[PDB]
Design a protein around this ligand. Structure first.
Ligand code: HU8
Length: 94
């Protein structure tokens, strides 16, 4: 993995729009580890069916709050570092 374990364990405070997104899929707190944020975002992607049904490693996030927060219309889920960077746009580290 390109994401160090200590990074996955970092405690963060999502900004209000990301926080709203996480709560929409059952999150209950204001502070999270990065691994929690990522997992809830994955749940969000599945409930909103943002992944391409025929190419399930591609997410199309245009016209969804996620696309606005990430600043891209689409991404490959294999791009782990890019995804972490896009998440960082939307939080403050504890
Ligand atoms: C099913 C549960 C909810 C367990 N998936 C996740 O939490 C994974 C996840 C969460 C958020 C986002 Cl933006 C992408 C992904 N995500 C996905 C998507 C696919 C479409 C449905 C939603 C998940 N696929 C991979 C993957 N596939 N092969 N390699 N990476 C990754 C992923 C994994 C580890 C990583 F550090 C990163 Cl940065 C991203």
């Amino acid at each position: 993995s390109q994401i160090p374990a200590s990074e996955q364990e970092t405690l963060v405070r999502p900004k209000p729009l990301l926080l709203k997104l996480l709560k929409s899929v059952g999150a209950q707190k204001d502070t999270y580890t990065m691994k929690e944020v990522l997992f809830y975002l994955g749940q969000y992607i599945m409930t909103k069916r943002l992944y391409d049904e025929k190419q399930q490693h591609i997410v199309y996030c245009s016209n969804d709050l996620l696309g606005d927060l990430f600043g891209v219309p689409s991404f490959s889920v294999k791009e782990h570092r890019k995804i972490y960077t896009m998440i960082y746009r939307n939080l403050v580290v504890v």
